[PDB]
Write a protein that binds this ligand. Structure first.
Ligand SMILES: [O-][O-]
Ligand SMILES: [Cu+2]
Ligand SMILES: [Cu+2]
Ligand SMILES: [Cu+2]
Ligand SMILES: [Cu+2]
Length: 505
């Protein structure tokens, strides 16, 4: 097992524009097969990287900044990870498309799974319109991130290394004096399994595969043996004894983390997926499922000299192993102060989302279910529909709906809707055997309103087993063709994803 905390945390450089003016900012990002050492003791690992980097470069934009990105595929024509040809039915093997997660984006710049392109746009999927994506950024300051979304290949192209951070800065938040600049640090967390030769391992089949199974075969879940942050296995970060802001992004395929500091110190949560909370929240720990973001302050002022482990208590296919996946990274409070800490950790951050009083146009009830294929594998389905079935989720532009998500399965699914952020209304336990036998929904306890961490704006939300989760979303300001899906990539690809039409009457 790799020795923990021997590599310094990489800080991705901030991408420089190819062209910028006051009316427009223009970037170019090229997907490249590259090699990078992931740990002191490993040979360099072959990866797919935005601009040949893992993670990709951090993009930083201002609210309402008029941004264009030309995302280019300059990858090999063959993949290096195991492709299952039975999950989707002449197309190029390597297909890519960039989704800016949390982006308030016109539909043809949103990275629709069927808007894929091969190397140099030589072949393009049926929903492809444009090479240069347009991000108007007319939305709250928040932590976003970008990753590959290509139909039936997401779990592989993301696992290969196609992820990066994207920060929107709202200049009206500056007066809050949150830690900034070098004291504001993204933490992109990805679990990986790495072979002795340093090559990525991703399973070609379930363990002890029925001889029925195809080869390769998709697996329902991926749990990595090692944890990386910003592309290094279990790294350390040297910090000054003062306040830092961290943008924590879970960029893992399946794995959920439950994070804490091993010296018992607090996080101060200042933000969720959709931006600043109305009030900061002190937390001893927090759950973070794939695609969720936490915007937090950690105060190292009282901890000079100490080494503090960011620890993880959430299992993935089993309990955490204290020597490995119980560890994320280590902070070392040994860097001298560069200047007085002038940052703040204010209580009052933003307006409450509940100041809004929108009419409920529609209430959808959606179930998380599935079936078994001709090979005996589980196929995960939203409302027992396939991706290819005619669209059923058709909200009207400008209106607000409540979605009631029924989860009678054994696990949590982190549910994500494109375009919008939403409010969490409540969660409520129900009798699973009764639901499965009759389709009748019988509650076993009262509704539970969201904890303070879920009283801001969310875009990816944990829907736990044996519960009904209700959220409220306003669909806008764009109309068009989007998606909603589980953000466990192994579920998403087979087949837990649905189109979503936002209609203009
Ligand atoms: O990921 O959407
Ligand atoms: Cu995403
Ligand atoms: Cu998204
Ligand atoms: Cu799922
Ligand atoms: Cu998506």
């Amino acid at each position: 097992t790799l020795e923990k905390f021997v590599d310094a945390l990489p800080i991705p450089d901030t991408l420089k524009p190819v062209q910028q003016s006051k009316e427009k900012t223009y970037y170019e990002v090229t997907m490249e097969e590259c090699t990078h050492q992931l740990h002191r003791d490993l040979p360099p690992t072959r990866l797919w990287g935005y601009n040949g980097l893992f993670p990709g470069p951090t993009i930083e934009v201002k609210r309402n900044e008029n941004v264009y990105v030309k995302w280019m595929n300059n990858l090999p024509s063959t993949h290096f990870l195991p492709i299952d040809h039975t999950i989707h039915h002449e197309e190029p093997e390597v297909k890519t498309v960039v989704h800016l997660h949390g982006g308030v984006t016109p539909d043809d710049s949103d990275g629709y799974p069927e808007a894929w392109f091969s190397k140099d746009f030589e072949q393009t999927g049926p929903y492809f319109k444009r090479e240069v994506y347009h991000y108007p950024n007319q939305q709250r300051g928040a932590i976003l991130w970008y990753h590959d979304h290509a139909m039936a290949l997401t779990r592989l192209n993301v696992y290969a290394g196609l992820v990066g951070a994207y920060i929107i800065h709202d200049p009206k938040e500056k007066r809050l004096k949150l830690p900034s600049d070098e004291y504001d640090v993204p933490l992109l967390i990805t679990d990986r399994t790495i072979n002795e030769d340093g090559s990525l391992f991703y399973p070609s089949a379930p363990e002890n595969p029925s001889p029925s199974l195809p080869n390769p075969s998709i697996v329902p879940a991926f749990c990595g043996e090692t944890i990386l942050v910003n592309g290094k296995v279990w790294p350390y970060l040297e910090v000054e004894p003062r306040k830092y802001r961290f943008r924590v992004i879970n960029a893992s395929n399946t794995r959920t983390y439950n994070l804490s500091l091993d010296n018992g110190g607090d996080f101060i949560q200042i933000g969720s997926d959709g931006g600043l909370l109305p009030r900061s929240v002190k937390l001893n720990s927090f759950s973070l499922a794939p695609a969720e973001r936490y915007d937090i302050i950690i105060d190292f002022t009282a901890y000079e000299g100490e080494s503090i482990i960011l620890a993880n208590s959430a299992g993935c296919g089993g309990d955490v192993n204290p020597e490995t996946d119980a560890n994320i990274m280590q902070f070392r409070v040994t860097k001298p102060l560069a200047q007085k800490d002038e940052s703040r950790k204010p209580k009052y951050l933003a307006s409450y989302p509940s100041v809004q009083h929108e009419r409920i146009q529609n209430i959808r009830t959606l179930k998380l279910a599935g079936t078994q294929d001709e090979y005996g594998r589980p196929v995960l389905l939203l409302n027992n529909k396939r991706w290819h079935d005619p669209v059923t989720e058709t909200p009207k532009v400008g209106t607000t709906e409540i979605w009631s998500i029924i989860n009678p399965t054994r696990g949590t699914h982190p549910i994500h809707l494109h375009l919008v952020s939403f409010r969490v209304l409540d969660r409520r336990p129900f009798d699973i055997a009764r639901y499965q036998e009759s389709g009748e929904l019988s509650y076993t306890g009262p509704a539970v309103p969201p904890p303070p961490s879920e009283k801001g704006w969310k875009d990816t939300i944990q829907a736990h087993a044996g519960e009904v989760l209700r959220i409220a979303a306003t669909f806008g300001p764009y109309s068009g063709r989007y998606v909603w899906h589980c953000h466990i990539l192994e579920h998403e690809d087979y087949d837990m994803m649905r189109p979503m039409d936002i209609t203009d009457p």
